[PDB]
Amino acid sequence: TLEKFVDALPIPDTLKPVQQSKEKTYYEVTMEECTHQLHRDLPPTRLWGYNGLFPGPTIEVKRNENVYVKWMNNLPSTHFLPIDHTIHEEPEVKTVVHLHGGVTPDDSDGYPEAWFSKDFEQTGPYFKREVYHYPNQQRGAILWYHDHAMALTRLNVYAGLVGAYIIHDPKEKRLKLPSDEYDVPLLITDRTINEDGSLFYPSAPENPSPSLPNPSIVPAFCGETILVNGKVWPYLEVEPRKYRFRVINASNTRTYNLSLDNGGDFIQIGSDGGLLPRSVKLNSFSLAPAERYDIIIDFTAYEGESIILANSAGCGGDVNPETDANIMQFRVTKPLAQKDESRKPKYLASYPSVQHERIQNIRTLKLAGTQDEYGRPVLLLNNKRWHDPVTETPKVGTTEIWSIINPTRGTHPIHLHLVSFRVLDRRPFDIARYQESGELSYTGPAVPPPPSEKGWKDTIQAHAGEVLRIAATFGPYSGRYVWHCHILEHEDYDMMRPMDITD
Ligand SMILES: [Cu+2]
Ligand SMILES: [Cu+2]
Ligand SMILES: [Cu+2]
Ligand SMILES: [Cu+2]
Numbered sequence: 001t002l003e004k005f006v007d008a009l010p011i012p013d014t015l016k017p018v019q020q021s022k023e024k025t026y027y028e029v030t031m032e033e034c035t036h037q038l039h040r041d042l043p044p045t046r047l048w049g050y051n052g053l054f055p056g057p058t059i060e061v062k063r064n065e066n067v068y069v070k071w072m073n074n075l076p077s078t079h080f081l082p083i084d085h086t087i088h089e090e091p092e093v094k095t096v097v098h099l100h101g102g103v104t105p106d107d108s109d110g111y112p113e114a115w116f117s118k119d120f121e122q123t124g125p126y127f128k129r130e131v132y133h134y135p136n137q138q139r140g141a142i143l144w145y146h147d148h149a150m151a152l153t154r155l156n157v158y159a160g161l162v163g164a165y166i167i168h169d170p171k172e173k174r175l176k177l178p179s180d181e182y183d184v185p186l187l188i189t190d191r192t193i194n195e196d197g198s199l200f201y202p203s204a205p206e207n208p209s210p211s212l213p214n215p216s217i218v219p220a221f222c223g224e225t226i227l228v229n230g231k232v233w234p235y236l237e238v239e240p241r242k243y244r245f246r247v248i249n250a251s252n253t254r255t256y257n258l259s260l261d262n263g264g265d266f267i268q269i270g271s272d273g274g275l276l277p278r279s280v281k282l283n284s285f286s287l288a289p290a291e292r293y294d295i296i297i298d299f300t301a302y303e304g305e306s307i308i309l310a311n312s313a314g315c316g317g318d319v320n321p322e323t324d325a326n327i328m329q330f331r332v333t334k335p336l337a338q339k340d341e342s343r344k345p346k347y348l349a350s351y352p353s354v355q356h357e358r359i360q361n362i363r364t365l366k367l368a369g370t371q372d373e374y375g376r377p378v379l380l381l382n383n384k385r386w387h388d389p390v391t392e393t394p395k396v397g398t399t400e401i402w403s404i405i406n407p408t409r410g411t412h413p414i415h416l417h418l419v420s421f422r423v424l425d426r427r428p429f430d431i432a433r434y435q436e437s438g439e440l441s442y443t444g445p446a447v448p449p450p451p452s453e454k455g456w457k458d459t460i461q462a463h464a465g466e467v468l469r470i471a472a473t474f475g476p477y478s479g480r481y482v483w484h485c486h487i488l489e490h491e492d493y494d495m496m497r498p499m500d501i502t503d
Contacts, residue, residue, distance in 0.1 A: 056163025106479030190223030270294025273420030273456025
């Protein structure tokens, strides 16, 4: 296997606007097939990248900055990864960009059926506009952008269409958090790479039933190799001081459970939806697909050391000490450019619990599924298909509790568009009894969220055998959005539903 920690961590350049005034910032981003070397010892890999980069350029905006992005498809007319044509003439290559976490008007949110082919020659039934509008009227946070095209999301994302998008609120500057060169995104993606450098994505389950189409979707993808910022097991040279990292799980299926191999702590300062009310000292943390952790790592006491960012979470089996147990390596050998004037404050933001919204509605939602004519599992939210008439129809400006029941064997990272939400609690229940009768009998008391989940979230781990309750205020925009599992292999077949916020 590939030798760990021989390539420096790339830092994506920050995207420069095509036009910018006090009233408007305008960007252009073009999807291109490109080649890049993912490791010292590999031939260049063919990829799909925003502006021909993997990851795409980092976009930085201010809170309330009036931003437009023209996202363009200049990709080949044929894909290079295996398309399953049975899960959904139309063009083969359909794309649409979703700003994950964005408080975004519905026609700029990247609805799966708002796709477009090269040069917008053909467009999906929900397409309205070429140039997307992000007003950014929302808390400072780590967002990220990625492809969202119907039935192709797991492939277009795996091909390399992911990037970071950071909202900076000037009111947070007074906290003196590590900034500029000392504020670094870490986009983590697992990949399997062939000898010739080409990406491998499975054409079918291992030992495929002859009943299966070819290609066939698979219910989960676990990559043999871990990349950060588009390089296999990289190293980053850091100064002996405080750094802020924006950690983004941009993987299709894999969940990470991260730690430092010298026993050092992370200080979590933010979740999906922005700063936590209070910083949280952690030895380890779980990060499922699309979750973000905003953290400080303090390298002050570790000068000279090499520290491995390690992973303990299996993906289809236990971690391998030599491969997926490793993410990246910090080397604390960079000379100080200046005095560390950054801070690691305890008091960060107002508590979400300061809010006292009336509960308009309580929705009970089950995570389930069925079997198709080929014998494959089809994952379903509330036993509805994507194409079934809309059922999740919250009223604009109102707050609901969603009770998510998971009787399956695994965790699903549930994501809602537009909003961030509060976590209320989790409670274990009797799976057998629920499967046999539909009755919910609890086997233990409710567990309130840990400190890492006392702020705002948009993607939430719903564990097996538990009911998870969240509270969300649906606003400020009305329109047609989506909610779904963020395991992309589940999302595409068929664990995604429309969500109408009604006026
Ligand atoms: Cu997403
Ligand atoms: Cu999203
Ligand atoms: Cu799932
Ligand atoms: Cu989505």
